Design a protein around this ligand. Structure first.
Ligand code: CDP
Ligand code: NAG
Length: 246
């Protein structure tokens, strides 16, 4: 398991968390020096438990699918909650079985559905360490509309930061003041699958992508990534979704 406490948190302790989260995900190969997540993992070992504590010391445990860094659900006191999707229903066979009751949330976990439920796109939802503390707090008691927003924060500040050093840095810069994500951050989130695929297809193609990936950069300019020499590949991306899952 991995843990993160908001009480006393700073950029360093957050970076240690995100490093622990990355290191907890299994891999047997690197591709261009980036860990390649596994095609599949059977049974319970498929799910990492993240223990998150708000500033007051209250806690939820979040279940994460180690093949794709997808959050499946969470435990808050004696109630478990899972996304309304088959992968989460499967996860509920393995994690938090000791919950006194299990609630299926009224949406799946993908960004489009969560934004619909929350009533706003994630361009408009501030993220940061304060936002994470609020998210955890919200998730402690069921409210499905409030939870959608909370989960959009939680996904970005855990999984998406594990995937991209740039995103991890963006949260660090919001350690004490929330701010909506940069467009670059949004772009990288949306491109993770595509990037992961193209980096893998590059291996038998002399480091060249079969299909260019369009990102937004730090300055809000849209740019094409065509090969493994790009800083998105050498510096930024930390985890690859296996092509078998794409
Ligand atoms: N059950 C789920 C589903 C998605 N997600 C997250 O949402 C991201 C986007 O999934 P997607 O590409 O299907 O989202 P949409 O923009 O298509 O709605 C994933 O890469 C995960 O970071 C999650 O944490 N748990
Ligand atoms: C490869 O990417 C680098 C870095 O972005 C770029 O300057 C170069 O023009 C690209 N070359 C090819 C052959 O795709």
């Amino acid at each position: 398991d991995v843990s993160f406490r908001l009480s006393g948190a700073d950029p360093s302790s957050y970076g240690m968390f995100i490093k622990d989260l990355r290191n907890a995900l299994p891999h047997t190969e690197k591709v261009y020096n980036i860990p390649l997540l596994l095609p599949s993992v059977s049974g319970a070992g498929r799910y990492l438990l993240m223990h998150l504590f708000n500033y007051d010391g209250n806690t939820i445990t979040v279940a994460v699918d180690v093949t794709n860094v997808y959050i499946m659900g969470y435990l808050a006191l004696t109630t478990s909650y899972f996304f309304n999707e088959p992968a989460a229903d499967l996860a509920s066979q393995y994690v938090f079985r000791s919950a006194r009751r299990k609630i299926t949330l009224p949406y799946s976990g993908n960004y489009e559905r969560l934004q619909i439920a929350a009533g706003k796109p994630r361009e408009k939802i501030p993220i940061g360490l304060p936002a994470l503390d609020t998210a955890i707090s919200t998730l402690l008691h069921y409210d499905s509309t409030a939870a959608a927003g909370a989960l959009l924060v939680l996904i970005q500040t855990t999984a998406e930061a594990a995937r991209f050093k740039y995103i991890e840095q963006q949260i660090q810069e919001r350690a004490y003041r929330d701010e909506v994500p940069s467009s670059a951050t949004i772009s990288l989130e949306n491109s993770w699958s595509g990037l992961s695929k193209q980096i893998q297809l590059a291996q038998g193609n002399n480091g060249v992508f079969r299909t260019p990936t369009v990102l937004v950069d730090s300055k809000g300019n849209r740019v094409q990534i065509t090969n493994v020499t790009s800083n998105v590949v050498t510096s930024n991306i930390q985890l690859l979704l296996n092509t078998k899952n794409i």
